[model samples]
Target: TRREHDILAFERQWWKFAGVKEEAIKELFSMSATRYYQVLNALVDRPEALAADPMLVKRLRRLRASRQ
Candidate 1:
């Protein structure tokens, strides 16, 4: 569904467009930031998410890899 797409797009750079990620999470997804990150962290690892946005997915993967 579109919500999932929106969720993925939002995760890509919500911090840039939105003043605060948590505020955007409440306004856009109407969910807590904790829940949003839970979904996002999982989503970024999915094949569908990578197919949808390869660059973003790869970037996130690299970031996560470095963090680990």
Candidate 2:
């Protein structure tokens, strides 16, 4: 779905902004902030997701690893 792709791209871009993200996700994706993160955490391990955005996936995975 393009939604997922856009979500990946959203992750790519949103880091530059401030506190608009969670509410932005609500309006943009119509998903809860918790669900948005759930999908994001899952996407980092997904092949197509990594293929779509290698650097973002690596950075996301690295941050996830560091948190554990």
Candidate 3:
């Protein structure tokens, strides 16, 4: 739950508003963007995360789908 909460909290902010997402990942989560995305990719699929923020989750899912 905490991990999911952290993901939601991070998603709430506009990473581009500060700087590049890679840098923000390192500064905020102290993890590589690759790893951060790995977690986020998984998080977005969870029902709880979708319920927590449908707009964000749907947007993320769309982006993920486009990528694939």
Candidate 4:
């Protein structure tokens, strides 16, 4: 699952370290912020993504819960 792997890579590489910005999301993924989160949220639900990056997945889920 290259797509999933790539998403994880991007998140790991950039999510916070490179600065999470709407402009960055649009340019990198060619997707709106809403759309980007949709993809991330979907991946967050999948076990495969969690396995691919445990700490990242945990952080994402934790933030998601806090945001709610």
Q: What is residue 67's positional error in candidate 2, in angstroms?
A: 2.5
Cα lDDT tens digits, model 3, 7-65, are 87686675555557578679987898777867876777898998997699888879868
Evaluate model 2: give its lDDT. 0.80
lDDT tens readout by residue for model 1, 1-68 = 99999898887676566657567679997888878888889878888998997699889989889999
* Models, CA RMSD each: 12.6, 12.5, 13.1, 12.7
Taking all chains together, the TM-score of candidate 1 against the true structure is 0.65
How do the residues 1-68 of candidate 2 rate in per-residue lDDT, one tens digit apiece? 99999898797677645357666888998898887887777767888988998798889879868999
lDDT of each: 0.82, 0.80, 0.79, 0.81
Q: Ranking under TM-score, best-scoring first?
A: 1, 2, 3, 4
How do all models score by TM-score? 0.65, 0.65, 0.59, 0.56
Model 1, which residues run further than 4 Å from truth?
1-19
| Candidate 3 residue-wise lDDT at 47 | 85
Weakest lDDT window of 10 consecutive positions for candidate 2: 14-23
TM-score of 4: 0.56
Candidate 2: stretches off by over 4 Å? 1-18
Q: What is the lDDT of candidate 1?
A: 0.82
